Design a protein around this ligand. Structure first.
Ligand SMILES: CCNC(=O)Nc1cc(C)on1
Ligand SMILES: CCNC(=O)Nc1cc(C)on1
Ligand SMILES: [Zn+2]
Ligand SMILES: [Zn+2]
Ligand SMILES: [Zn+2]
Length: 459
C-alpha cells in the first residue's frame, strides 16, 4: 500500500462549520470530486491528491502549511495564508496583500512556491488543518492530471501555464499560473481533541496567534513537524542530496579529529568522556588517553539535563579529564568540555523551521534539534580557528603562493617557513572548517585551551 487509497474514509467533522450539511460518510474519491477535480480513472503516477503520514515524512522538505480564512466564499473575499508568512487576499470579482482577483493571485502563488521550493524538493505538500474553505479554494489555483516532466529539463512538472499550454518544474516556472499535481495532508485526520491552537500551544510557545491565515498555516506545519519528528523519531528514513551534505559531513569528521587531538596534546587529559552517539568510534584512535563512552541518542525535543546524564552513581568522575559533546545537546555544559552544537537559527537549504524554537536539520536523516541557547555555553568559550599538524614536511605528488599564518601550527611554521604540504593541508582544512561553520555548527571549548601549548609538541 505505497500510496493512500482514494477509497479510504475521510472524517468530515472539521469541515462542517464552513460546509454545513457535509456527509459524514466520505472517501478521498468523493472529497476530490466535490473539490471540483476529476481523476478520470487515470493510472499515471498521481493516484491521490492526499498522501499518507509516511509519504509526507519522506517529503518533509516539500511541506507548506496552508490555511484559508473567510474575510467576509464565491460571494466573499478569502485570505490565503502560507507557512512562508505570506497572506494573499483573493476576491471573486506577516505580509498582508490587498484584495485581488484569482487570475493574479494564482501567478503570485506559483512564484512564491517556486522560490521557496526549487532548492528543497521536487514537489509541494500542502499541510492543512482542514475546515472547508482551503479545500474549496484549490480549484482556483491547482490543475491535476498525469505525471509530467518539465518543458526545459528532466525534473518532474510542478507548474502549468495556460498562456503557453506547457509544464514546468520549480526552477523553470517564471510566468506560470497554475500549481500542477500538488500533494496535501490533513493533520485533523490523525485524531486530535480540540482546535489547532490548543494542540499547537501544548508543544510550542514561539508561534503566536495573530488571527491571520498565515499564523494558522505556520501552527499547522509546526504541529505536524512535532508529531512526525519530535515525539516520533525515525532514523531509518533517508533523504536525497540537495546541496553540500557530503562535504559538510566530511568536514565535521575532520574538525572533530583536529580539535580533540589538539586538546589531548595541549592539556594531556588522562581520560576522555565521550557523550552521545551510541555508534561512535574514537575520533583520535592513536591518542594515549583512556576513552570512555556514554550512550545518548540525539535529543529531538528539549536539551538533555546534565544532572540526568551525569548524576545517578562511568569513571564516576566526569570532573576528571575532559568531556566531549559532539552534537549531544545539553542544557549547560560542564567547564571541562569540547563541544559541537548545531545553531538552529542558521539559514540553509538543509535547515527547515522546527517546533518551539528548534529546527529540522535534514542531511541524510532528519534531525529535529532543540533551540540554540547561548546560556548553555557559560562555562566555556568559542573555539578559535587553528590548524595543527605533526606529520612530516614532505610534498608527494594545484599551484602555489607561500602561506603566512599565525594559526598554521606546524614544525615548518615554528621553523620560520610553512612547507608546501602543510600549506596545501592548511587551506583544505580551512575550507572544510568554513563549510562546517556556515552549515550552522558552532564550536566551544574549556577556557584553559590555548594553541600556544601545541608548539612544544615539536621538540
Ligand atoms: C468538499 C467540497 N464541498 C463543497 O464545496 N460543498 C458541499 C456542500 C455540502 C452539503 O457538501 N459539500
Ligand atoms: C548524538 C549525536 N548526534 C548525532 O549523532 N547526529 C547529529 C545531530 C545533529 C544536529 O546533526 N547530526
Ligand atoms: Zn525544469
Ligand atoms: Zn509552533
Ligand atoms: Zn611542514
Amino acid at each position: 500500500p505505497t500510496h493512500l487509497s482514494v477509497d479510504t474514509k475521510f472524517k468530515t467533522e472539521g469541515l462542517c462549520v464552513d460546509i454545513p450539511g457535509i456527509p459524514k460518510d466520505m472517501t478521498y474519491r468523493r472529497l476530490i470530486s466535490m473539490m471540483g477535480f476529476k481523476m478520470n480513472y487515470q493510472v499515471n503516477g498521481y493516484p491521490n491528491m492526499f498522501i499518507t503520514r509516511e509519504e509526507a515524512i519522506r517529503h518533509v522538505r516539500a511541506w507548506i502549511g496552508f490555511d484559508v480564512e473567510g474575510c467576509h466564499g464565491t460571494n466573499l473575499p478569502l485570505q490565503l495564508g502560507f507557512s512562508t508568512g505570506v497572506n494573499l487576499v483573493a476576491v471573486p470579482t506577516p505580509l498582508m496583500y490587498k484584495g485581488l482577483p484569482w487570475n493574479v493571485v494564482r501567478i503570485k502563488i506559483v512564484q512564491m512556491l517556486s522560490d521557496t521550493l526549487k532548492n528543497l524538493s521536487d514537489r509541494v505538500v500542502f499541510v492543512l488543518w482542514a475546515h472547508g474553505f482551503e479545500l474549496t479554494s484549490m480549484k482556483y489555483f491547482v490543475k491535476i492530471g498525469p505525471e509530467r516532466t518539465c518543458c526545459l529539463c528532466d525534473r518532474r512538472a510542478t507548474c502549468f501555464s495556460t498562456a503557453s499550454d506547457t509544464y514546468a518544474c520549480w526552477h523553470h516556472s517564471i510566468g506560470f499560473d497554475y500549481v500542477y499535481n500538488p500533494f496535501m495532508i490533513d493533520v485533523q485526520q490523525w485524531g486530535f481533541t480540540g482546535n489547532l491552537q490548543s494542540n499547537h500551544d501544548l508543544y510550542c510557545q514561539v508561534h503566536g496567534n495573530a488571527h491571520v491565515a498565515s499564523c494558522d498555516a505556520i501552527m499547522t506545519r509546526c504541529l505536524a513537524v512535532h508529531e512526525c519528528f519530535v515525539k516520533r523519531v525515525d532514523w531509518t528514513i533517508e533523504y536525497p542530496i540537495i546541496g553540500d551534505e557530503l562535504k559538510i559531513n566530511a568536514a565535521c569528521r575532520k574538525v572533530q579529529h583536529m580539535v580533540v587531538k589538539a586538546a589531548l596534546l595541549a592539556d594531556k587529559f588522562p581520560v576522555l568522556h565521550d557523550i552521545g552517539n551510541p555508534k561512535a568510534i574514537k575520533c583520535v584512535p592513536q591518542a594515549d588517553v583512556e576513552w570512555k563512552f556514554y550512550d545518548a541518542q540525539p535529543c529531538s525535543d528539549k536539551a538533555y539535563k546534565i544532572e540526568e546524564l551525569f548524576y545517578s552513581y562511568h569513571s564516576d568522575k566526569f570532573t576528571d579529564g575532559v568531556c566531549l559533546f559532539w552534537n549531544c545537546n545539553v542544557d549547560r555544559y560542564p567547564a571541562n568540555s569540547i563541544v559541537c552544537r548545531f545553531d538552529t537559527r542558521v539559514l540553509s537549504n538543509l535547515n527547515l523551521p522546527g517546533c518551539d524554537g528548534g529546527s529540522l536539520y535534514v542531511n541524510k536523516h532528519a534531525f529535529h534539534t532543540p533551540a540554540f541557547d547561548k546560556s548553555a555555553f557559560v562555562n566555556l568559550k568559542q573555539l578559535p580557528f587553528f590548524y595543527y599538524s605533526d606529520s612530516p614536511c614532505e610534498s608527494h605528488g594545484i599551484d602555489y603562493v607561500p602561506l603566512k599564518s599565525a594559526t598554521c601550527i606546524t614544525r615548518c611554521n615554528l621553523g620560520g617557513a610553512v612547507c608546501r604540504h602543510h600549506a596545501n593541508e592548511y587551506r583544505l582544512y580551512l575550507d572544510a572548517y568554513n563549510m562546517m561553520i556556515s552549515a550552522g555548527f558552532s564550536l566551544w571549548v574549556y577556557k584553559q585551551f590555548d594553541t600556544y601549548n601545541l608548539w612544544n609538541t615539536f621538540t
